[PDB]
Amino acid sequence: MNLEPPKAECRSATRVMGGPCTPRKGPPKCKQRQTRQCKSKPPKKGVQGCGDDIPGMEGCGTDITVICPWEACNHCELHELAQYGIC
Ligand SMILES: *[C@H]1CC(=O)N([C@@H]2CC(C)(C)N(O)C2(C)C)C1=O
Ligand SMILES: *[C@H]1CC(=O)N([C@@H]2CC(C)(C)N(O)C2(C)C)C1=O
Ligand SMILES: *[C@H]1CC(=O)N([C@@H]2CC(C)(C)N(O)C2(C)C)C1=O
Ligand SMILES: *[C@H]1CC(=O)N([C@H]2CC(C)(C)N(O)C2(C)C)C1=O
Ligand SMILES: *[C@H]1CC(=O)N([C@H]2CC(C)(C)N(O)C2(C)C)C1=O
Numbered sequence: 001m002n003l004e005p006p007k008a009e010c011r012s013a014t015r016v017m018g019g020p021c022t023p024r025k026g027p028p029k030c031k032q033r034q035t036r037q038c039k040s041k042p043p044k045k046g047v048q049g050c051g052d053d054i055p056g057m058e059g060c061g062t063d064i065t066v067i068c069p070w071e072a073c074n075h076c077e078l079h080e081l082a083q084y085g086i087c
């Protein structure tokens with residue numbers, strides 16, 4: 001019968017859940033990664049981004065699985081004002 005009962009609980013959490021939350025049009029519309037969300041300045045390197053090809057296999061995995069900016073949220077090279085979330 002379907003997969004075995006999933007761990008839909010995890011008590012490890014505590015206050016990092018609940019509270020005033022109201023999604024919007026559900027998560028972004030993927031199924032077509034191209035240029036429907038990523039937009040700003042012409043394609044280049046560093047200033048803009050990098051222009052990879054198939055992330056999750058060669059784009060990233062080290063500065064995220066071992067040290068993700070979410071932990072030491074303070075260093076960050078550029079774009080430090082994005083800390084307010086006013087994005
Ligand atoms: C799955 C297990 C779990 O509980 N996780 C963490 C820790 C708590 C606080 C329990 N969560 O709800 C989050 C997702 C933050 C898991 O990732
Ligand atoms: C409300 C919906 C939600 O889940 N939110 C965030 C992100 C996750 C990890 C799903 N949470 O349980 C918290 C509350 C941290 C919301 O903003
Ligand atoms: C984006 C909220 C940016 O300021 N919020 C989100 C998440 C990241 C990846 C940081 N972004 O640039 C978008 C807009 C997708 C702002 O800081
Ligand atoms: C299709 C939509 C998208 O952007 N995406 C991401 C989601 C995660 C799991 C973060 N990832 O590494 C991929 C590239 C799969 C999709 O699967
Ligand atoms: C370098 C190649 C590229 O287009 N890019 C974008 C992709 C997303 C995840 C939208 N983004 O915010 C960056 C700047 C990473 C690269 O990383």
Ligand SMILES: *[C@H]1CC(=O)N([C@H]2CC(C)(C)N(O)C2(C)C)C1=O
Nearest residue numbers: 033038049050051052053055059
């Ligand atoms: C945002 C839109 C997108 O798919 N993208 C690419 C750019 C690079 C860094 C090559 N990459 O692996 C992602 C998926 C982030 C953006 O810059």
Ligand SMILES: *[C@H]1CC(=O)N([C@H]2CC(C)(C)N(O)C2(C)C)C1=O
Nearest residue numbers: 055056059060061062063064068
């Ligand atoms: C660069 C390519 C990518 O999508 N990615 C992950 C890493 C974490 C921080 C887990 N994450 O939510 C994104 C989508 C940025 C990279 O390391």
Ligand SMILES: *[C@H]1CC(=O)N([C@H]2CC(C)(C)N(O)C2(C)C)C1=O
Nearest residue numbers: 063064065066067068069070071
């Ligand atoms: C940055 C590095 C990474 O992969 N990551 C995870 C952490 C949670 C909140 C579980 N998540 O869905 C992302 C992809 C953001 C980071 O904090």
Ligand SMILES: *[C@H]1CC(=O)N([C@H]2CC(C)(C)N(O)C2(C)C)C1=O
Nearest residue numbers: 069070071072073074079082083
């Ligand atoms: C530290 C905590 C966090 O997740 N974060 C954002 C800031 C930007 C650069 C917008 N981003 O994509 C991450 C996830 C690093 C912080 O400033």
